[PDB]
Amino acid sequence: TLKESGPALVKPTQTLTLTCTFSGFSLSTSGMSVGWIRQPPGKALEWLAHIWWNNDKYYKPALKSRLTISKDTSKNQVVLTMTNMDPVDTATYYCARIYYGYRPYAMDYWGQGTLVTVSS
Template sequence: MAVLLKNYNIFTTEVTFLLKFPDSKVVQPGQSLTISCQVSGYSLTDDSYATGWIRQREGKPMDWIFHQWGGGTLRQNDALKNKFSYSRDTSAGTVTITGQNLQPEDTAVYYCVRMHHSDTNKHKPGQKLSS
């Protein structure tokens, strides 16, 4: 696997895949895993952008996990909010996802993503990303 930069249009939202993780990580059922992504080319505090995480499980639609706008507004997938936690370090330009109590059904390619779209659509609650 390698770094993947790709645009993906979802609900008039431009999504850029910032990172597809280069190595497989294997955990036993019930364990946790933390993955970090360092962004470049924009600031995590720029409210024109949101940075977050999505996953692609084999044979399933893409799952949106969460994203956070530069101003701090965090949107989460209610079905996954007890499974994953999100943090960001604006000074280091990193965003981190931690999965707890991971199970075989959590096997997926996890993507760090940047989203940008017009102010009129920016804060729609419950916006779900799917392919």
């Protein structure tokens, strides 16, 4: 199971740090990957980033300069950071687990998601 967590209100033009806590896997196994996806209210799913067990971070090229995904296996968590927040960034963020390491299907186990509004 995965559980995303982050400030529910961030003012525009600031960095937002989130955190995803795991259960049933640690991000040090041979093929485990954890991904962050946002979904603006009423819009389709927008993939953001995903990190493998070996600190191999992949981003969305549009948002690459702003997204920074880090993995801390001591606390068994993943931190997603996204700077210079804009009101368009108001969305529900989901932390997912990717079995591309093991199975040909990604994003099996999603968290409940955390809704963030970018406003002052």
